Amino acid sequence: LLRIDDHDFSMRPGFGGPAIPVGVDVQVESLDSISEVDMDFTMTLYLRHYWKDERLSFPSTNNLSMTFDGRLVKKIWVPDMFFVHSKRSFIHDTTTDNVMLRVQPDGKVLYSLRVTVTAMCNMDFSRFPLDTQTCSLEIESYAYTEDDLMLYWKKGNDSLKTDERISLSQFLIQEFHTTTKLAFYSSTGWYNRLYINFTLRRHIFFFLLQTYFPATLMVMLSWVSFWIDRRAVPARVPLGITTVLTMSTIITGVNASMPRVSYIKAVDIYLWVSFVFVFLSVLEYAAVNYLTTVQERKEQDTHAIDKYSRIIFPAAYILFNLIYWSIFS
Amino acid sequence: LLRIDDHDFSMRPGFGGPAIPVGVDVQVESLDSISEVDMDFTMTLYLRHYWKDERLSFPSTNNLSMTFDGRLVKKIWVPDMFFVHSKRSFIHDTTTDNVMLRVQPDGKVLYSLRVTVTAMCNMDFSRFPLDTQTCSLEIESYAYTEDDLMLYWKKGNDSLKTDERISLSQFLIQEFHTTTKLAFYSSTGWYNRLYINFTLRRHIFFFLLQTYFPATLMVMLSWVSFWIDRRAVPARVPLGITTVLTMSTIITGVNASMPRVSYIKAVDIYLWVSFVFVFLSVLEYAAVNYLTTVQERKEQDTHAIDKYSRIIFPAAYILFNLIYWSIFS
Amino acid sequence: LLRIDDHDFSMRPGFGGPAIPVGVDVQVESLDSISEVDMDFTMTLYLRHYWKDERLSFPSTNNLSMTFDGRLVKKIWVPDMFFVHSKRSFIHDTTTDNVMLRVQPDGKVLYSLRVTVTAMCNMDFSRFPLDTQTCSLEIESYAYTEDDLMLYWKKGNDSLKTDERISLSQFLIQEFHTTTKLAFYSSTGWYNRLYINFTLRRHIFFFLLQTYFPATLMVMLSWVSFWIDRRAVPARVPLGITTVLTMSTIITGVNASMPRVSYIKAVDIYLWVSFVFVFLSVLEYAAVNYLTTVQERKEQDTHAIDKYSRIIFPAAYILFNLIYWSIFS
Amino acid sequence: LLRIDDHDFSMRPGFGGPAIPVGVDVQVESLDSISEVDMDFTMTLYLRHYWKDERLSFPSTNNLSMTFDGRLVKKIWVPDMFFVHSKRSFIHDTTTDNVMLRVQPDGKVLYSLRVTVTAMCNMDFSRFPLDTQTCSLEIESYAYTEDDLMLYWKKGNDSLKTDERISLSQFLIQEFHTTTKLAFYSSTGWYNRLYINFTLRRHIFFFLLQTYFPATLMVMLSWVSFWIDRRAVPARVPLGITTVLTMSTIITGVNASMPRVSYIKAVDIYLWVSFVFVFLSVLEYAAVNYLTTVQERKEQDTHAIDKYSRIIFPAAYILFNLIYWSIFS
Amino acid sequence: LLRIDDHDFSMRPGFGGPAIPVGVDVQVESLDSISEVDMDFTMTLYLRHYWKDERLSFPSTNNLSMTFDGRLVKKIWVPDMFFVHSKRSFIHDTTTDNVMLRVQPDGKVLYSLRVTVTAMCNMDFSRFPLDTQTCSLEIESYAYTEDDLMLYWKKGNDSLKTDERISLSQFLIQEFHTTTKLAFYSSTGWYNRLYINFTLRRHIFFFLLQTYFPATLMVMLSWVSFWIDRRAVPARVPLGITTVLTMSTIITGVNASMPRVSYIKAVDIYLWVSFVFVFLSVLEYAAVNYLTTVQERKEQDTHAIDKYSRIIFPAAYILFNLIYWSIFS
Ligand SMILES: CCCCCCCCCC
Ligand SMILES: CCCCCCCCCC
Ligand SMILES: CCCCCCCCCC
Ligand SMILES: CCCCCCCCCC
Ligand SMILES: CCCCCCCCCC
Ligand SMILES: CCCCCCCC
Ligand SMILES: CCCCCCCC
Ligand SMILES: CCCCCCCC
Ligand SMILES: CCCCCCCC
Ligand SMILES: CCCCCCCC
Ligand SMILES: CCCCCCCC
Ligand SMILES: CCCCCCCC
Ligand SMILES: CCCCCCCC
Ligand SMILES: CCCCCCCC
Ligand SMILES: CCCCCCCC
Ligand SMILES: NC[C@H](O)CC(=O)O
Ligand SMILES: NC[C@H](O)CC(=O)O
Ligand SMILES: NC[C@H](O)CC(=O)O
Ligand SMILES: NC[C@H](O)CC(=O)O
Ligand SMILES: NC[C@H](O)CC(=O)O
Ligand SMILES: CCCCCC
Ligand SMILES: CCCCCC
Ligand SMILES: CCCCCC
Ligand SMILES: CCCCCC
Ligand SMILES: CCCCCC
Ligand SMILES: CCCCCC
Ligand SMILES: CCCCCC
Ligand SMILES: CCCCCC
Ligand SMILES: CCCCCC
Ligand SMILES: CCCCCC
Ligand SMILES: [Cl-]
Ligand SMILES: [Cl-]
Description:
By secondary structure, chain A is an alpha+beta fold. In chain A, α2 packs antiparallel against α3 (266-299). The first copy, chain A, has 2 domains: 1-203, no CATH class; 204-329, no CATH class. The first copy, chain A, has 4 helices and 12 strands, in the order ββββββββββββαααα. Chain A has helices at residues 205-223, 233-255, 266-299, 304-328, and strands spanning 20-35, 40-52, 66-68, 81-84, 86-91, 99-103, 108-120, 132-141, 149-153, 160-162, 171-185, 189-202. Chains in contact: A-B, A-D, B-C, C-E, D-E. Chains C and E meet through β1, β3, β6, α1 and α2 of C and β4, β5, β7, α2 and α3 of E. The structure holds decane (5 copies), N-octane (10 copies), (R)-amino-3-hydroxybutanoic acid (5 copies), hexane (10 copies) and chloride ion (2 copies). The site of one N-octane (OCT) has 5 residues of chain D, from α1.
């Protein structure tokens, strides 16, 4: 039906003349995973192309579109899109190549394929884990400059659809939209580039329950010492030491999961402030013990330091929490 | 025998006319693995197709079906099924492609292949680990709409068989069955979709023995303090502190295995209630020590608080367990 | 030499007539790994096929066998064996495909290839780690029923050889042998199936030294308490608590390595019995302390409980060990 | 257009005569990851080739360059570059091969491709983590010696461009530049080799906060003992022991992450010196207890050892830190 | 130039007559990694072949060798070497297949390729980590017996070269050399086999510092108890218990890294002897406490046991170390 043997498909339509326009639209099937250690995400989508080539015209009386097997895609000419700044990708091939080709009697062509991509995304963790991130996926032609191929969104802002099943267990997904920009390479020229943009927001419940509550409970345990007879030395000393030693484990367990950045995160501040709060309660009792021994040496109830600590330590911690949650909201 | 050189197999049977019907049936060989962190499962199965094409007719006197090598599959026309919402898949190829082709003298065709698939499954962990999940595998044609191809289960509900060897170490598998539904894509049209459905139920014995028993034993250890002379301060203080510090480790060891969901699970409730039960026994003795020191200061047996705690703490824990196992059964 | 252009190799020898017999023999090169979490093993072997096809006859005066390059395998007809219930496999291809083809002047053919397979194996862990497992590898034709192809072991029981280098660090390997059985699929018919069977036995030394000895040592540490003055409360209390808290870690470290089965293993019994032995020694001293305080209240040496515990606890543990190693031998 | 059927492209241009010159230039897209355990890095780049072949001449009036599909690359002759000392690499192929071919009417050719490489890099950890590393990527022709192919940087030092987005979370990247050298293989001859060089510098903030601070805090905790009444034996003994036991965990947690080198690293020195500082404070109190018991035996305030330790231990640690940070800056 | 269309390259040179000799030589580029858990190593090398075939003769006046593209390798005949007892391998293919072909006017051929291999190696850990291992890589023809192909090292012992960059962070590499042996398969015949042999020696510094020193320090901590007043029960009891409990962690941390062998390693002996040394110091004080209580009961300084332990325990440990390092050197 299609006159495939007649023509040299190594050359584009309009070869030697003005640029060929090619339109694009997209449907996202899933957003698959995200990594902070590697700074990347994975996405699966359907991608579609539109153009006209009169070498693929055929006669009919119905003026309708026809579908063809799919093994003809490797005989005709086809555009050459690639994903910019991507780590890896593939096209699906079970039970056969997931490819579709439809042609109109005047030579208009529709071409579609299903693909999975993993792409680069630079992340900022200064407000972690109360953070927000923004991402994009880039599309461009490899071989042809804007003097030979013209690339655009087919229907404007309506060119992007999203599956209603899309979900991530740790993030809220929002603000899908599309943009365009021109790009330059020194050795080869100017190119059109298409963008798909979106925003992510992290859920905090896991981190409350797994980090912020136990640190608070250790701080509250250290306060119990102020309520115990100053004469019970082998009770008051280990009570403080054990809380110091636990707070160290919590600090280690948090930071072992993240990338080794060169700046402080919002969770680090909270944990290290709680550490100094616990550390100071040990020096307090050391002072009380020394001053009591001096009194014994002079001579040979509740001490004022205990009496004041019972008020001062909790008030200070409450002030710190008010400030912190005013800053990070 | 088969006139393969005579015809253009880029076009379907009945091209330009009414839709071709294609029937399907399936046998599941194994259900291979399941992930909560990734929310997916893996399955291996045999998949079969049935249709008629008169371009593949041949003469004989016996009216019987014949089997052909398998290298002819890439010369003739073949339907184009794909698995919807799937992460990855392949066809087996040792010692050769695991493919079968049988043809009748009137052009009826039987086509079979062996495949492994990994597929998406959304999971709810609010009753974990006493939870039940339901899953499905989706089948659809990539290129042809319901105006060109008609897809149906060959024998109705009898179209699905299951291997007697199928098993999972952590789940009971039940309720295999098949359904159909129509699907719409904005840019390309209407399609028939086939479903395979099943249900999973988790075994709880591992979690009893590995989580619920040790937390109970820590709670029962904290009660021993009420039976010890109030004068033995360096004994009664560490006995409580060490149980608090162990309960924290159990809490951490559980949640380090699961996805970071934004809601509380049924096991979290039990562990955090046990934590507060243990935490309170430390404040109890702090109160007894303070009140004894006040009595000493005034002046200068078993305390009522101990006497009452010996009854109140165990009764409250038993009430809590009755309620909990009434709710989660 | 071979008349390859003359014939249609899409059709088997004797197409349209009685079944073709095909003989098989095997040499195992290595048994590569085993997984309890995944319930599978990996094997590498050489696999050989024997049949006659008169379309491959050629003239000679010597009546001897000749070897051919190997690129002819994709032109002639070849049998279609696959491994049943397998997870994955491949054929080796460095520096070229590891394939061999030899032909006799009357058309007798010998065909060989090297392959690696990973296969399913259901395992029972009720006597773990003193357990024994049995495994098998299954071989069958994909497309041809017993009416068209007949599959058998070439030399009877002599058809299976094993490399003298085969070894596993954790198991003793024994009892290699071969069997045959007929198989039925509802939609497609009856098939011949060949089996390779073997047995595995686990070495226990690692588990003695890494699990059973330290649990025993914790139990023996708990007994030291009975030998210490009942007046040293802050010594006798932590001595018991610390052993409870260590035994919990041993229990956790064992079960974190295995699949989450729904039944008790032989190592679980030992560890949980040792746990209760240690748990009881804490209640013992609690009783002694309470009864001493009652005597003080009445009034205002070694206690009989200590005196009896010094005999009763070790005797009971020794009785338990005699029974256990009588049952699991 | 191009006379591809006319010529034998198994032979290079100028076959049997002087060497063909081939020029190269490069743009780096990303530096992807680095491993100390494996001693390697990963890089993604665009690579370009320039040469003339008169068998690819064609007539035109415009004297301009033309772009061709890309399926012609496997028909014509093309240079054979490989990456020396590399572990693995691939060329990107979605949605098609990422390859470009441009030709001028006189037969000048431009050839480009996108690739990812993982390459060997020998590392020195004697000043870890205050260390600096230098790396390079090597390029060479596989089959042709300098008598048949001549390989050079196209534009001198201007032949290397770098993407402005390039970043690593743990390193500062600096000093990109290019060099050339001749290489010899005994069996096959002399070859031209091109180099791409760069330098890396590690950020230290993570290691301060995660290793050096907690070790210092343990040392400062051990000093508190000198301020406590020498009569409180069950307080002063555990205070020292627990710090020894914590310092061991820090030492283990650091070295579990790195390769098992045969020499001491700069972080090892700090940690083991802090260990001996803590170890000595236990022997100190042992001495005080023994000497006090001797005084009791003779007979039957603050001891001079405590009085002097309160000054000597901190001064010594401060001297050690001054020296250390003078050496490692 | 080469008459490729004239001949049947499915047949070897001298087909039907005496065996063809094929010579080999090798250059090792890198030794990439080693695993004790899997018992294997990985190697990358260049491999070369030499033979004569008069079907590849061509006329010239210069009598020199010529290089050809590399796409002709799949048209001519080529030998069929494979690596015996190997787990996996591949040939490098970026930017093209890393293959070289050179031919002389009389039909002498040189063939080269670059490859990476992973190979089996049986290891003995009875003297671990002071152990020495020996390894080899095996080379053989798949399809042709010694009656049809003759395989030998081209230049004798000079056939093996090694890159000066080769290094491993944990081993000293020594004693590279080559051997030959004949091999028999029951079903198929006799074959020539080539060997590459080498030796490895482990560096011990990591294990000194990470295992042997801390165990010694725990033993020395247990001795401090003998220097403390026998009346300080809550000090002397935990001092011993905590060292027992730490030594258990060291024992576990070592053996969690290695394969689960059925025999004792040299490091196990040291650690378990140190364990009993620490265990005995607890029974010592238990005895002293009991005997003191008996003296109190009779009645109603330093004990001889302490006095003797202060000499006996260290002397015994020093004797043990002398013997151990005399045996394992
Ligand atoms: C880490 C040094 C701690 C010193 C404590 C001094 C207390 C003095 C009380 C007057
Ligand atoms: C965490 C603060 C604990 C305060 C305990 C107060 C006890 C008062 C007893 C009357
Ligand atoms: C967990 C509850 C423990 C109760 C101990 C009671 C001892 C009574 C001795 C007569
Ligand atoms: C590890 C041996 C410790 C010995 C301490 C001796 C102290 C003597 C004080 C005079
Ligand atoms: C594990 C049993 C320990 C028994 C200690 C007995 C000491 C007796 C001293 C005479
Ligand atoms: C102690 C944790 C407090 C968490 C407050 C969160 C406010 C949104
Ligand atoms: C940008 C630094 C914020 C630090 C705030 C500290 C709140 C107590
Ligand atoms: C302490 C755990 C109790 C578990 C009860 C389970 C009831 C089915
Ligand atoms: C849906 C919340 C259930 C909480 C029940 C608490 C049982 C003590
Ligand atoms: C305490 C462990 C005893 C192990 C006995 C094993 C008997 C074969
Ligand atoms: C099948 C259960 C065996 C339990 C034996 C217990 C031995 C003390
Ligand atoms: C206690 C850590 C001190 C770190 C000093 C770093 C100086 C650049
Ligand atoms: C090259 C060894 C440096 C050691 C310096 C020690 C500083 C206290
Ligand atoms: C305490 C460890 C001693 C190590 C001695 C090593 C002798 C080569
Ligand atoms: C082969 C056993 C060696 C054991 C030596 C023990 C040294 C104290
Ligand atoms: N748009 C792709 C680039 O032009 C590739 C290159 O720079 O070679
Ligand atoms: N049924 C497959 C879809 O039609 C693919 C697409 O939307 O392009
Ligand atoms: N023996 C292979 C089976 O017949 C395959 C199938 O059931 O389709
Ligand atoms: N430049 C590549 C080397 O010549 C390859 C080999 O030595 O065979
Ligand atoms: N040398 C390879 C072996 O002959 C292969 C086989 O035994 O089939
Ligand atoms: C940005 C610095 C914050 C530090 C608070 C301790
Ligand atoms: C004390 C916690 C209050 C924080 C409110 C955001
Ligand atoms: C759904 C909330 C339950 C919380 C019980 C503490
Ligand atoms: C106290 C446990 C009983 C729960 C019964 C389901
Ligand atoms: C099979 C049950 C055994 C349980 C022993 C405690
Ligand atoms: C007490 C251990 C003896 C067990 C013998 C099998
Ligand atoms: C290079 C040796 C340094 C050791 C310092 C303790
Ligand atoms: C005591 C820390 C000072 C180090 C300055 C580099
Ligand atoms: C080979 C046995 C050695 C055991 C030493 C305790
Ligand atoms: C006490 C350690 C000496 C060992 C010498 C090899
Ligand atoms: Cl005490
Ligand atoms: Cl204590």
